[PDB]
Ligand binder design. Structure first.
Ligand SMILES: Oc1ccc(O)cc1
Ligand SMILES: [Zn+2]
Length: 257
């Protein structure tokens, strides 16, 4: 199936998913000088106090921390968003080397990794019907740079040994995603897509300007995971990022002056 190698990576995905060459694909380069402050944006509200994590899973493309989204518990609202979006999962994209790994770039700068907190619009009832809508999803994207350890990441790093290969999962209750957020919620926003197949164009992206710092040791542990399943030849899970796609007829709006 699709992946990130020479033979099945991003430059191939359009064959099975022609929306790969669509009009509002993600990620994009954020040209900070061209992004315009939008005084029409309402304050962003990240409300993660009642978040209920359940499980961590290696899906062969990344690992996902999954949440109970059967009720309004961890939600995103405000900023560009109309109504309430429920957190369903987070995951990361990262590099084989510290100089690459993010999907969005900032004035062509690649960070070492990028976190995506995926939310769906509760007007649509569940995630599967939300991905049939042009405003079905909101993804909060957060850059990681290598520097000081992030203490609120270490519970994720420590469980990775238990989900090394594709299809492995573990319990992952009581994890507080507030520990992954930077101090500032200044952001850029634009309409885009899932960055993995099926590449659906449902996503309001909200990309925070402030990166979080993680340690070299933390990111090295991400790079020990495997794309393959248990008892298949080992292929390190690295460079699981899609490069920037054409901006087309879109404008990137800033939340800050
Ligand atoms: O459900 C989603 C998964 C990945 C994305 O990049 C966006 C939404
Ligand atoms: Zn992602």
């Amino acid at each position: 199936h699709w992946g990130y190698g020479k033979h099945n990576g991003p430059e191939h995905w359009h064959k099975d998913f022609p929306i790969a060459k669509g009009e509002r694909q993600s990620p994009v380069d954020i040209d900070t000088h061209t992004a315009k402050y939008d005084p029409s944006l309402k304050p962003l509200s990240v409300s993660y106090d009642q978040a209920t994590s359940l499980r961590i899973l290696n899906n062969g493309h990344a690992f996902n921390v999954e949440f109970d989204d059967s009720q309004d518990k961890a939600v995103l609202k405000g900023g560009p968003l109309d109504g309430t979006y429920r957190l369903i999962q987070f995951h990361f994209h990262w590099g084989s080397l510290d100089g690459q790994g993010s999907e969005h770039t900032v004035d062509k700068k690649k960070y070492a990794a990028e976190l995506h907190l995926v939310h769906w619009n509760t007007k649509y009832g569940d995630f599967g019907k939300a991905v049939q809508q042009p405003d079905g999803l909101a993804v909060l994207g957060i850059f990681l740079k290598v520097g000081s350890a992030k203490p609120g990441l270490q519970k994720v790093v420590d469980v990775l040994d238990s989900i090394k290969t594709k299809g492995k999962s573990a319990d992952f209750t009581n994890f507080d995603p507030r520990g992954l957020l930077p101090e500032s919620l200044d952001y850029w926003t634009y309409p885009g897509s899932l960055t993995t197949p099926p590449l659906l164009e449902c996503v309001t992206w909200i990309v925070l300007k402030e990166p979080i710092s993680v340690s070299s040791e933390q990111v090295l542990k991400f790079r020990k995971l495997n794309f393959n399943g248990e008892g298949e030849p080992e292929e390190l899970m690295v460079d699981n990022w899609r490069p920037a796609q054409p901006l087309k007829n879109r404008q990137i709006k800033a939340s800050f002056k």
